[PDB]
Curated annotation (Swiss-Prot), chain A:
Main location: periplasm
Domain of life: Bacteria
Disulfide bridge positions per record: 32-71, 106-113
Protein name: Negative regulator YfiR
Activity regulation field: TpbB/YfiN repression is released through an YfiB-dependent sequestration of YfiR to the outer membrane. Binds vitamin B6 (VB6) or L-Trp at the periphery of the dimer, and both VB6 and L-Trp are able to reduce biofilm formation induced by YfiB L43P mutant. However, VB6 or L-Trp alone may have little effects in interrupting the YfiB-YfiR interaction. GMP enhances the binding affinity between YfiB and YfiR.
Keywords: Disulfide bond, Periplasm
Function, in words: Negatively regulates the activity of the diguanylate cyclase TpbB/YfiN, leading to decreased c-di-GMP production. Inhibits TpbB/YfiN allosterically, through a hydrophobic interaction between the C-terminus of YfiR and a conserved region of the periplasmic PAS domain of TpbB/YfiN. Under reducing conditions, may also act as an YfiB-independent sensing device that is able to activate TpbB/YfiN in response to the redox status of the periplasm. Part of the YfiB-TpbB-YfiR (or yfiBNR) system, encoding a tripartite signaling module that modulates intracellular c-di-GMP levels. The system is a key regulator of the small colony variant (SCV) phenotype, and plays an important role in biofilm formation and in vivo persistence. The c-di-GMP produced by TpbB/YfiN stimulates the production of the Pel and Psl exopolysaccharides, which promotes surface attachment, generates an SCV phenotype and confers resistance against phagocytosis.
GO CC field: periplasmic space
Chain positions recorded as GMP binding sites: 21, 136, 138
Complex formation: Homodimer. Interacts with TpbB/YfiN. Interacts with YfiB. The YfiB-YfiR complex is a 2:2 heterotetramer.
Phenotype caused by lack of the gene: Deletion of the gene results in the generation of a small colony variant (SCV) morphology in PAO1. Mutant exhibits slow growth, reduced motility, a highly aggregative and wrinkled colony morphology, strong attachment to surfaces and strong, exopolysaccharide-dependent resistance to macrophage phagocytosis. The deletion mutant, although suffering from a tremendous growth disadvantage, shows characteristic persistence behavior under antibiotic selection and during prolonged infection in vivo.
Post-translational modification summary for this protein: Cys-32 and Cys-71 form a disulfide bond in the oxidized form but maintain their free form in the non-oxidized YfiR structure. The Cys-145-Cys-152 disulfide bond is well formed in both structures. The Cys145-Cys152 disulfide bond, but not Cys-71-Cys-110, plays an important role in maintaining the correct folding of the protein.
Covered range of the whole protein: 40 to 181 of 190
Length: 146, 148
């Protein structure tokens, strides 16, 4: 069930956000969905964190040069290697949480990579990406909220 | 700059355009459209559409490994699938009158009947003449001139 998985993806992302800190916390958390996705329809309706902060969601282009300043979070879909490189050049130097919908590979690119097929959603963490991202991640994430 | 919104609305309009040239052996009261696999430009169609004749187009996302795509869908809008998944989808559609359109790809000769090219100045599409010839849905030949 795609709608059911989409709802689980929303819940997992909210769980993850709760463990992440930005150097200057926004009043409104900006989420950008970038590239082809199956499970982002829930995200795109927008969400609210338990702490009361709204999550505003927009779909944006891979080649938008301002992803780094428009987004606090990027939910990255199924893009090719060149598109991936372009996205992360745009994010370089900006404090951006990155999560990929798929996780067949999680050694290049996103901080977390979801595995949405199967019984429950799981994820892999890319420690090198986390170290370079500019956001702070609580080890408790590395889903129950903080 | 690339506009995901403009491209998404353009895709919706192109799909409606293509539908206008197609007839099903038993015309459904509501055209059922299935969005299958990761997509970038389907957010608009997923809100639902209406043909010029008043028939509603209902859209739902369905799983690539859903065995019943053939009876659930009148139209499939196909996102990113690898060759093994692609074959699974079209095995599910075999024997059913289903119009297939792919969002993106390098080749339009296996699988989907129409292949969109959403990049560039305007949306264009290719027609897969072999898939079209094998399909149980009927495509009026005049659509093939709009193909580029």
């Amino acid at each position: 069930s795609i709608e059911q998985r989409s709802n689980a993806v929303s819940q997992v992302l909210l769980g993850i956000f709760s463990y992440v800190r930005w150097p200057k916390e926004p009043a409104v958390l900006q989420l950008c969905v970038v590239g082809p996705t199956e499970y982002a329809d829930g995200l795109l309706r927008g969400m609210v964190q338990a702490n009361g902060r709204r999550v505003h969601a927009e779909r944006r282009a891979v080649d938008n040069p301002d992803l780094g300043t428009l987004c606090n979070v990027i939910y990255l879909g199924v893009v090719d290697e060149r598109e991936r490189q372009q996205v992360f050049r745009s994010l370089a130097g900006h404090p951006v949480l990155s999560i990929s919908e798929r996780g067949t590979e999680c050694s290049v690119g996103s901080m977390f990579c979801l595995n949405v097929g199967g019984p429950r959603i799981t994820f892999e963490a890319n420690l090198d990406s986390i170290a370079r991202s500019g956001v702070r991640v609580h080890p408790s994430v590395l889903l129950e909220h903080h």
